[PDB]
Ligand binder design. Sequence first.
Ligand code: GTP
Ligand code: EQF
Ligand code: CL
Ligand code: MG
Lengths: 208, 128, 1017
Amino acid sequence: VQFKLVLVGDGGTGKTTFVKRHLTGEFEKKYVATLGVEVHPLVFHTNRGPIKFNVWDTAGQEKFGGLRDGYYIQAQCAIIMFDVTSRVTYKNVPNWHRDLVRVCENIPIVLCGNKVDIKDRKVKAKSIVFHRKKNLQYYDISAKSNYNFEKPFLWLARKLIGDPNLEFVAMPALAPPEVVMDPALAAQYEHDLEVAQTTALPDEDDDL
Amino acid sequence: FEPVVTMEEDEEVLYKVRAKLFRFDADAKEWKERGTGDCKFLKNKKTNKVRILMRRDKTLKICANHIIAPEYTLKPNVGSDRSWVYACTADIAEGEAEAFTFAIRFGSKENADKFKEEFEKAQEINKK
Amino acid sequence: SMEGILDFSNDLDIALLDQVVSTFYQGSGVQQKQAQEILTKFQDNPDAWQKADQILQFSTNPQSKFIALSILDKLITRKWKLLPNDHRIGIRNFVVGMIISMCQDDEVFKTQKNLINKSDLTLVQILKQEWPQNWPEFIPELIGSSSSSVNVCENNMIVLKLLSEEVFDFSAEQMTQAKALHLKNSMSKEFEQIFKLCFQVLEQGSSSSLIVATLESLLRYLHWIPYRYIYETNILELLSTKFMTSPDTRAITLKCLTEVSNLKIPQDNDLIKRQTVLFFQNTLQQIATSVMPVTADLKATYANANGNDQSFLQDLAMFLTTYLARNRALLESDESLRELLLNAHQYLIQLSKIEERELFKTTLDYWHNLVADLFYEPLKKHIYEEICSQLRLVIIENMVRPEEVLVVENDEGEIVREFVKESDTIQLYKSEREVLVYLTHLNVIDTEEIMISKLARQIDGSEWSWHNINTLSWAIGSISGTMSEDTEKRFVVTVIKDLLGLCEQKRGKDNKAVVASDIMYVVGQYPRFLKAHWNFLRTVILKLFEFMHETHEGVQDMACDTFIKIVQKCKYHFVIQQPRESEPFIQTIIRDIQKTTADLQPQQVHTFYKACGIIISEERSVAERNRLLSDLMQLPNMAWDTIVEQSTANPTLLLDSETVKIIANIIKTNVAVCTSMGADFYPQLGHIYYNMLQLYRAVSSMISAQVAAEGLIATKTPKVRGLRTIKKEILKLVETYISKARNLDDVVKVLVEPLLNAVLEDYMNNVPDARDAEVLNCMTTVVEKVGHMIPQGVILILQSVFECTLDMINKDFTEYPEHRVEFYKLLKVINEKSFAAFLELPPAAFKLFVDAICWAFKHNNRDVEVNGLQIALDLVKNIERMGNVPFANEFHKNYFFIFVSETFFVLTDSDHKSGFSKQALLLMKLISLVYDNKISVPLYQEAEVPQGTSNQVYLSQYLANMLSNAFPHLTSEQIASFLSALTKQCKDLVVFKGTLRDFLVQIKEVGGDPTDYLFAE
Ligand SMILES: Nc1nc2c(ncn2[C@@H]2O[C@H](COP(=O)(O)OP(=O)(O)OP(=O)(O)O)[C@@H](O)[C@H]2O)c(=O)[nH]1
Ligand SMILES: *[C@@]1(C)C(=O)N(Nc2ccc(C(F)(F)F)c(Cl)n2)C(=O)[C@@H]1C
Ligand SMILES: [Cl-]
Ligand SMILES: [Mg+2]
């Protein structure tokens, strides 16, 4: 039970950062432009059982475009990403959508305005109307603050499973191994622990 | 007159606190967030064994699942007065038992100190 | 082994290709990643297109053929004119032939839609290159071949749709002005024949899928075709009746009718008015009979989400809102049209109950449009009385949580503090407020009656819930200012009375927290009432003080914000002595400030002091204000005085992390009160200023000492972050004060010298990772307000910050982002207000300055880029103002071409799209300097060109050469023509920009037409 999901949008909009957040929980601060596409399995647990998205996270930058519209072939859903602190990224949403629906007629699509966490927003809420005539779901999101971060996937799952009351649910949690001891020595542990202590945790000003 | 036609039920909650969990990536020499949500100390009513179970907010995906082993030691992180670091040899959150160096930061220093107190109590319970 | 296809010295193994392609799309893991890299390298091989015909004939994988066509697409769009004419005919023929071939096999046509759509688009790319000048008969032959096969007819509608899109909808970015006009005019000239085929198919058409394709093509034509094709054929009848009954055509027809609606027809013509009414009447008739009646529960229907129902309801809302926004007046006068008007609005009412945020916003925009019109337009609101009354209910019951309400219910059913702000919710609240405010004005009796009787049903418990008391409370608060003061009086009294009763009658913490938040919101929203009722105002403040002791953190926080909010509006009533009161209330507040704030978090305490500052500033007697200010600051001033004794007895007491916190909070407290009091804060700043700058020095020392003893890692420790917080808050306080100061003489003679001495050298002489970017921010404000009065000061600031900061930010674009931003804001203000400081720079440092400006251009960071281009524009104006003198002559000789070429570089590299306007402006200014002989000396060396040669001629020559080497695939004429146009247009910015946009298109392909640059002329 898996669905091909294409993620498109201008470079630097936060596509890869968003996916990573979903994969590992991590927040990647550095900008390493995606080369072509990266495919990632991504599973969610729902009251209608597990759903798997094969996420085709594509390149936004023309020079790293690679296959371009070829990546969309047989996609069953998509996310279009822009950045609310960069007007040009919204101005380009129609171009991404054009290329996407020429290959993928009739699929559920979410439009996402990333980086709402940043104070000086440039693409005002009132401005964001492109999705209406194109029947796209829209969400304000922030990969950084995790604001509405689940919403794109919950909505897509609802559309693809065809159940409007689908919820994410708590995955079962097996009793973990009581046999903690593996190597008697644990020499390797001591080197890692000292390094880990003396490397500062990021974002020590955040509320958590 | 005929009418209308997780595995945590068997565990007790000793302690719950909001927190952010990191794991150390030795290759990158950087801390990476693994999850944000409720960190719970769960005492199995059948074994009396106490575990950490932590779920991400909204997705509810497990980002920590491991026994509060007697051998573990909470250590300070150079950057924080509200975090603990420790080595864990068997976390099954992402499936197959794996070793991680974890860090866990709290909203306040009191929370961090409370966590440490509870953590050491749970270690005691786990010894018997 | 997959890498075989990359080797072009051999024939392409097609079977191997298909394996690689299959592995990418259908495979996984490492094999998928390897296959992806290989296909990418294959595709980008500039000879790969030669293998295209091979892959189309011999492949058994549709994705292989897709990728072949992508290879062809990239050839056609970028290098088409470079091919000899044989290859152009050849490629055309096998694209056209493959399309015909795929449409004739019924099974392939059915199952290979992706591949055929890609083929059609590829054909359209060829049309853009050769139609119609080298393909006059494309359109007639397309129309002819349409009767030959139903599959070919259908596919032709796809081709025409794609063509209309490419010419009319997406041409602006992707073609020159001239080419876009050529192709629009060409489509326009042959549209008559296109339309007849399209109308034939619609009248007599059998195949449902052909009808759909034809309607899809029509949707695109409605963006541009003349009105006559719509209103002088029978086509409106067809859309609004026939094509609305069948559900497979309904969707596209409704979107088509929406586009027609959106046109503004000539008002004078009665016949067009009749038709605009009729298609609407027909459409609503087909909806009532074939889809759902007006009473249908669209909220339930949307929630069920059967088939396409959600999409259809969306499209219906778009149709009704679009049409009624531009044409409802046609329905408002004629009695026979009143049912139709009200039914359309009744549908909208039903649509507005759908639980779906973004749809709600679409309907809410329409309601705003209507209620705003009914507010001004005479004799209209009576028509919509029953609609508006229903709407009042919908909105009062769907009010979203305002910013100010900080309690919310979680997934365990507890009322708690809000984790974060909601900006999506914020705009929605404002939109709801606007409509509901208008609705209230349109019938204030109805609004009051709905709200009051809803309140009655909260009391008696019939409708009691958290949701129900909340939405109601928020709506009641939202309409503040709509009523008379007397109605407001009675209304607010009733509301408060009943909310207090709710509170008594409910038990438990959660309940008390809900009703507390609701009362707090309401009273905060009615300052006018509070102003006129001192006894009540006093009570709520005293009650807010009580809430500052609440253990429920949500309520605590909200009391603090409500206090500030009431104070922002009612401050005058706190500063004077009210009747029956012994003293002004500010006096009462200040006396208990210790007990009042004792359970608050530091930042809440600061808010409290800020609020008190708002009040104190209301007192215009200098003696009394300064005294109140003295009184307010008594706790922090006592703590401060005892800290400064201990601290200056020995610099070791400051190590204590508890002491660092105390100091930080003292300064923060000062910042809070300065923020609200501005210029009135000066005496308090004077009390602490000299000792504070000594503390800044002492704290600096400890930071440097720590970094020496522990390493760069020390900057991450709690102790050092706390010490740095002290420096940041000190800088913030000085910035805040100087930003609002009225007496600038004191700033210059008292504040500036000690400040510069305390901060500049400390910044300069710290390691990069220990420099506070807040220093730069402070200096920016200093230069902003008093720069003109401290010329030697500004020089000192540059010396101390300019080169060391530049070296931090000039290795990459990523590191020290805060310094980066503040740095360019500093240079901007210095260049505006104190340009002399840049003249006094040694030549080497002036060169670094220019390097710094151009460096800013190349940022993607909008904060840096925007300031970069501004500095450059302002520098040029600064130089031009100096007139004909040696510094200006040397500047032009040294830097004019650097600025021109650097501006061109960022214009043309496709990585700085965001700064296009300002880039263009800078470039225009530079070129105009030469065309107005505002440069007094030659920009070329004597040996280099013939003596007496004008700068105009030399600039042409320089630029031609630059572009020739930078873009070698352009012809000489392309470059000559562009520069000729560009230089001519250097006073008309919008034309100039058009010429640049034309250039950015042409550099992306070969053989661009040089005559395109005559498009304005
Ligand atoms: N403040 C903020 N920054 C973000 C957010 N999401 C991503 N970023 C940052 O913005 C940059 C975006 O990086 P990516 O996710 O690599 O961008 P991309 O869209 O994948 O870019 P391409 O791969 O070139 O298409 C990174 O530096 C992220 O740390 C967000 O929600 N808020
Ligand atoms: C409960 C909400 C309530 O009514 N309380 N008393 C009270 C008295 C006066 C005021 C006011 F309006 F500010 F003057 C308020 Cl908000 N509440 C409570 O104390 C309960 C929280
Ligand atoms: Cl906004
Ligand atoms: Mg990416």
